[PDB]
């Protein structure tokens, strides 16, 4: 139960569907499955062909250049889980160069544990934007999809209605489906670990993705970790053993597995049937247990291995001694560094040389954890034990606090390393102790670390003068030991509301230093009031072919601006909702020019117009229109409105409104905005 | 007459005006004159001090850090000509770091034949824009003027009226003078070579600059070429011999000159008293004649010489054999190449290596005329007989039609040569015969020749469609041996009123070549009618570390619209 079929370890199928019937009954394939290179197949060769029995694949799965096939909903309706122990350039699902493959129907796929998915050169495939990979994968940014039918936008990959979840991702709701029929199932935000059932209840704590009954280890569909006899289990109870991270086997099983290479003979450690023991361990004639002892040499093929992915990496997983040379070349675009670290150099020695060529995203080398010694018994051509070229993101090699390095023979080869400055280079020379080896042009002294000023020399500001429209800085004028080499001063400035982070200045006359009255400076005019700015300065000096005087840069500093008379208080609306109440409302001004303290409010009693007092309204023409000195005032604080009381019925009022960004000394305030209003008659 | 004083050859004066009275009477100083490093001088130390006796200096003249002096019209009112045989970084007049020096008054200076003038760090000097150098010099674009009182625009350097010629040069009439009194004299457009007299009449065909009477070899002021006894002469009549390009001397004079190094012992050849003979020649015990014979090793100091100017060059003038190594380093800014050719390697051999470092304006090496062999017996470190770095204008080395090259040992070193494409580099490897020596990265395969598409491959347009609003070009689709490497098509377009000489296109599908219907095109909309356009295409491909497939460029074509 939970798995009615068998194991049937992975065999890959070619050229016709004849050997496909060898892999019918089995429920979970150990290893991987590849289906490839069937040019003489037909669409009718798949309609009489289905395998619902497969549920989980351990390692990976591949589809490559088979004609006549258009879907996968029939061949594998019920594949659900990919564990991904053995990966494939950090992928586990290969959909590639498949002519006529237009859809998947892979709705039952729920979680892919480790790896990613690459889809390429499949000019019929659609229904792809309807696939939320985050429900199935963790690192969705490692999924390359290109050269497909969706890339020429034609497919209406729709479903009739509600069912399929239309979830917002980037711009709007994305309807999630697999076919026009099959929606993409979404478990709720609490059943995410072990999957959910049909109504959405959480499964048992050892289920995964699907369960036949909610909260039942005996009625799951897929185990999260381990399987044992109708129960998904958290661990192997004694005397059982974890085999390939998915099940518990007895002693006799992994015992008799050893007896068949007479190829991967097996041993036991940590209640686990494993291939081999690491260093300091020994087999056992009784039970094949990795016993500790006194004193693991992974001798390469031809002493050499190009290393480019996890597929390369797991071949040297757990090794301690490398009897060969290593080549690091990853044309990448994605940091694999943690997974790179996870199966790498728990070693000290490399018998031959080390090569690092044209890798892109490798920012560091700290994943070499215990790496100490370079023997270099076989050197790189040009007499090198070390190589380095074309590493666009490499900045740090190691912290030389506790990391060490011993290099027996060979030399260093540093070229085209635009984020690798010479400081840690010479530190590596020092800690290597091999400084008396390197000739000229063993280090490219024009390309290595030429994107940021690095090394040592720091500028220090002597004086700061600020204004609302002026900036002056004063700092110590540094001079290199040849004072003629100073060409000028590179200055970078910008504004910065955060703190999470261009002009040039001629050098002055040096001419002495009892009183070198040459403290250099620059005036900025382009200032905004009350505004935070971020400024730093670099020294422009002449390059020399020798050990050049490294030149200085300044600290990034933050200086905020001041303030000034705020702008016009926008839209004064003066409504009189009562006979003595006038609401005046307004918008903030366009330029507050500082933190606004208050709003200066003036209301002025405008008398009636004086020409009306000497007119004869008893004559026809009686058309009446239904309409320093201290004025009454208000400092409206933290409000964009003000109702005014104690007002006359039938009296027009002038209103002068200003804002004020300064209140306590000598009020800096806005310019006058005007309106006029009239109270209601009683 | 014409020169009543004497020669008094060049000695340079330091630390006080005491030794200056050694050089009083003399008419034309052979060699050079430098006056330097006098801090404790006063302006009163010059009003009782004048030398009108000097008219011409042969080689050069230098003024360096002497205080209290403000002018020069008193010390040398009548210096007139600088010939300029021995130069000083292609200058013959050095005015440098002179505190209080505010004007010149050097009105009698008329022609400077060879060399230039450099002015620097003289924060008192003015009257500078009033000096037409074209009247006095030829290559006026080799004159360096900076760090002066003129550089902070204050001096009104005017004259009271007419006198001084106000000549349009660049923007308007430029008044030409030396002081507020001394105008700059301009001879007419017919008396230009030999100079003019006061009223403007032409001087004699052997005069130069000034003449006491117009058209009189016996009443010149300065000779054009040669002097003999009150007459400026075109050459030496017998039995006389040319000495230092300015006079005629007898056999007795240059004879007795030889008898004094017992340092420049002299011989005679080609009716000339000269220092030495070139290769294949022999002296004479009777008359010191460069007689031809069968079979000039300019053995250097420590086998090494940095070469930077003509002053470095004339030390190796006319050499044939170099027992040493040469360093070519000219942070220049001006092409010296003709005069560089004028006194250089009529040679075939170099015993040591050759170095070329950071030279800027050297577009070619054709001034190397006869060079064939490098022995390389002392190498550049790193086992090189040859060196090349940082040459921002170097494109051609030589024409390998007739130029040859023989290399014994050593290697090649090519870096940062941004207009030096690899084709002629491999041709140099071939004609050298030392192709089986160069390792990896002896040639910078990224920086050498990366400013213009060079190598081989030419695009050819199959079809042309024009309009007044549409342009379509179709060409033969080139495909490299890895068709994946083609990433796009770089196109450069612009209009062209003369013929004296930007968009991208994606690559189409290769997929076959019985019928590769992939003749690629671009439609242009931005057309003006009746307008001539200049269009050409480059192929954008993938770099590889190996011998990369060089990529194609098209021809600059001209298309006139409707």
């Amino acid at each position: 139960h939970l798995y009615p079929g068998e194991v049937c370890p992975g065999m890959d199928i070619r050229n016709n569907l004849t050997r496909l019937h060898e892999l019918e009954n089995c429920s979970v394939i150990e290893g991987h499955l590849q289906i490839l290179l069937m040019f003489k197949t037909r669409p009718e060769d798949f309609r009489d062909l289905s395998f619902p029995k497969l549920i989980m694949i351990t390692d990976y799965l591949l589809l490559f250049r088979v004609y006549g096939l258009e879907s996968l909903k029939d061949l594998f309706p019920n594949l659900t889980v990919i564990r991904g122990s053995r990966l494939f350039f950090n992928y586990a699902l290969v959909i590639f160069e498949m002519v006529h493959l237009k859809e998947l129907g892979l709705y039952n796929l729920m979680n892919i544990t480790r790896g990613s998915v690459r889809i390429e050169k499949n000019n019929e495939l659609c229904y792809l934007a309807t696939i939320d990979w985050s429900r199935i994968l963790d690192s969705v940014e490692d999924n390359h999809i290109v050269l497909n039918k969706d890339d020429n936008e034609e497919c209406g990959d729709i479903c009739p209605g509600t069912n399929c979840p239309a979830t917002v991702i980037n711009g709007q709701f994305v309807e999630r489906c697999w076919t026009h029929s099959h929606c993409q199932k979404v478990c709720p935000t609490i059943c995410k670990s072990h999957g959910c059932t049909a109504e959405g209840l959480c499964c048992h704590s050892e289920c995964l993705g699907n369960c036949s009954q909610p909260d039942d280890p005996t009625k799951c569909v897929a185990c999260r970790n381990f399987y044992l006899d109708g129960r998904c289990v958290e661990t192997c109870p004694p005397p059982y053993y974890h085999f390939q991270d998915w099940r518990c086997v007895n002693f006799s099983f992994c015992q008799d597995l050893h007896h068949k290479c007479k190829c991967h003979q097996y041993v036991i450690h940590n209640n686990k049937c494993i291939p081999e023991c690491p260093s300091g361990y020994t087999m056992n004639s009784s039970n094949l247990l990795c016993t500790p002892c006194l004193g693991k040499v992974c001798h390469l093929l031809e002493g050499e291995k190009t290393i480019d992915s996890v597929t390369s990496a797991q071949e040297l997983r757990g090794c301690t001694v490398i009897n060969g040379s290593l080549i690091i070349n990853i044309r990448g675009g994605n940091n694999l560094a943690a997974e790179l670290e996870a199966n790498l150099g728990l070693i000290e020695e490399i018998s031959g040389y080390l090569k690092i060529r044209r890798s892109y995203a490798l920012v560091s080398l700290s994943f070499f954890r215990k790496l100490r010694l370079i023997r270099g018994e076989t050197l790189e051509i040009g007499n090198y034990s070390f190589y380095a070229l074309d590493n666009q993101n490499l900045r740090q090699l190691w912290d030389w606090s506790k990391h060490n390095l011993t290099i027996t023979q060979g030399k260093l080869f540093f070229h085209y390393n635009p984020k690798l400055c010479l400081s840690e280079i010479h530190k590596m020379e020092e800690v290597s102790g091999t400084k008396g080896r390197q000739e000229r042009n063993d280090i490219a002294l024009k390309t290595n670390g030429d994107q940021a000023s690095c090394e040592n020399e720091l500028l220090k500001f002597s004086y700061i003068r600020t204004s609302f429209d002026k900036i002056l800085l004063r700092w110590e004028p540094y001079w290199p030991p040849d004072f003629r080499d100073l060409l000028g001063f590179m200055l970078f400035y910008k504004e910065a509301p955060y703190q999470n982070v261009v002009v040039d200045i001629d050098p002055p006359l040096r001419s002495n230093d009892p009183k070198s009255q040459n403290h250099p400076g620059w005036l900025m005019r382009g200032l905004k009031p009350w505004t935070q700015y971020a400024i730093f300065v670099k020294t422009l000096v002449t390059f020399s072919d020798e050990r050049r005087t490294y030149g200085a840069k300044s600290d990034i500093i933050y200086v905020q601006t001041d303030a000034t008379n705020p702008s016009v208080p926008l839209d004064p609306i003066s409504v009189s909702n009562s006979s003595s109440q006038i609401i005046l409302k307004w918008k903030p001004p366009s330029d507050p020019n500082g933190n606004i303290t208050h709003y200066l409010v003036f209301w002025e009693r405008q008398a009636e117009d004086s020409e009306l007092f000497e007119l004869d309204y008893c004559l026809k023409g009686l058309k009446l229109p239904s309409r320093e000195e201290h004025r009454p005032f208000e400092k409206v604080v933290n409000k964009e409105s003000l109702v005014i009381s104690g007002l006359r019925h039938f009296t027009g009022y002038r209103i002068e409104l200003q804002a004020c960004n300064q209140d306590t000394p000598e009020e800096r305030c806005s310019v006058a905005a005007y309106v006029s209003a009239r109270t209601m008659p009683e | 007459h014409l020169y009543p004083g004497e020669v008094c050859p060049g000695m340079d004066i330091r630390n006080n005006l005491t030794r200056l009275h050694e050089l009083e009477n003399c008419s034309v100083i052979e060699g050079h004159l430098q006056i330097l490093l006098m801090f404790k001088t006063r302006p009163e130390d010059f009003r009782d001090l004048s030398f009108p006796k000097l008219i011409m200096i042969t080689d050069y003249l230098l003024l360096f850090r002497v205080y209290g002096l403000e002018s020069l019209k008193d010390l040398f009112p009548n210096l007139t000509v600088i010939r300029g045989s021995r130069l000083f970084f292609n200058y013959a007049l050095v005015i440098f770091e002179m505190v209080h020096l505010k004007e010149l008054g050097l009105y009698n200076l008329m022609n400077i034949t060879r060399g230039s003038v450099r002015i620097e760090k003289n924060n008192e000097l003015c009257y500078l824009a009033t000096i037409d150098w074209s009247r006095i010099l030829d290559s006026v674009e080799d004159n360096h003027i900076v760090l002066n009182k003129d550089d902070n625009e204050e001096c009104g350097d005017i004259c009271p009226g007419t006198n001084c010629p106000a000549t349009v040069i660049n923007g308007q009439f430029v008044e030409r003078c030396w002081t507020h009194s001394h105008c700059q004299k301009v001879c007419p457009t017919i008396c230009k070579s030999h100079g003019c007299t006061a009223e403007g009449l032409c001087c004699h065909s052997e005069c130069l600059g000034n003449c006491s009477q117009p058209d009189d070899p016996t009443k010149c002021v300065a000779c054009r070429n040669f002097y003999l006894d009150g007459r400026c002469v075109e050459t030496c009549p017998p039995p006389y011999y040319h000495f230092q390009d300015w006079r005629c001397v007898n056999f007795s004079f240059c004879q007795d000159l030889h008898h004094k190094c017992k340092c420049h012992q002299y011989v005679i050849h080609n009716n000339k008293c000269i220092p030495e003979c070139p290769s294949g020649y022999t002296m004479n015990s009777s008359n010191l004649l460069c007689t031809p014979c069968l079979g000039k090793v300019c053995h250097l100091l420590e086998g090494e010489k940095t070469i930077d100017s003509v002053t470095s060059a004339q030390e190796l003038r006319g050499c044939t054999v170099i027992n040493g190594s040469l360093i070519i380093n000219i942070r220049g800014g001006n092409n010296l190449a003709a005069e560089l050719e004028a006194n250089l390697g009529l040679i075939e051999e170099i015993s040591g290596y050759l170095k070329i470092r950071r030279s800027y304006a050297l577009v070619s090496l054709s001034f190397f005329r006869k060079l064939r062999l490098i022995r390389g017996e002392t190498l550049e470190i790193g086992n090189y007989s040859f060196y090349a770095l940082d040459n921002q204008n170097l494109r051609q080395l030589w024409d390998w039609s007739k130029h040859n090259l023989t290399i014994t040992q050593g290697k090649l070193f090519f870096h940062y040569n941004p207009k030096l494409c690899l084709s002629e580099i491999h041709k140099m490897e071939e004609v050298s015969g030392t192709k089986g020596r160069q390792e990896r990265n002896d040639i910078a395969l990224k920086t050498n020749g990366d400013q213009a598409s060079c190598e081989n491959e030419l695009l050819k347009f199959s079809y042309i469609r024009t309009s007044f609003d549409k342009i379509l070009l179709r060409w033969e689709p080139y495909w490299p041996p890895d068709f994946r490497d083609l990433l796009g098509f770089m196109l450069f377009y612009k209009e062209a009123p003369y013929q004296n000489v930007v968009v991208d296109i994606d690559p189409p599908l290769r997929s076959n070549d019985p019928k590769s219907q992939n003749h690629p095109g671009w439609l242009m909309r931005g057309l003006k009618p009746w307008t001539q356009y200049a269009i050409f295409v480059k192929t954008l491909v993938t770099f590889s570390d190996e011998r990369r497939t060089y990529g194609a460029k098209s021809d600059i074509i001209y298309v006139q619209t409707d």
């Binding site: 003629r484 | 490093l37 970084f89 440098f96 620097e120 930077d308 800014g333 800027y360």
Partner: peptide
Amino acid sequence: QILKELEESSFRKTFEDYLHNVVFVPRPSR
């Protein structure tokens, strides 16, 4: 772009150097 000015300043420096090299050793002869 303006790197000719950059090498021009070094040219100025070389011109500074050479005059100083002329001034330097006429004196030590011992």
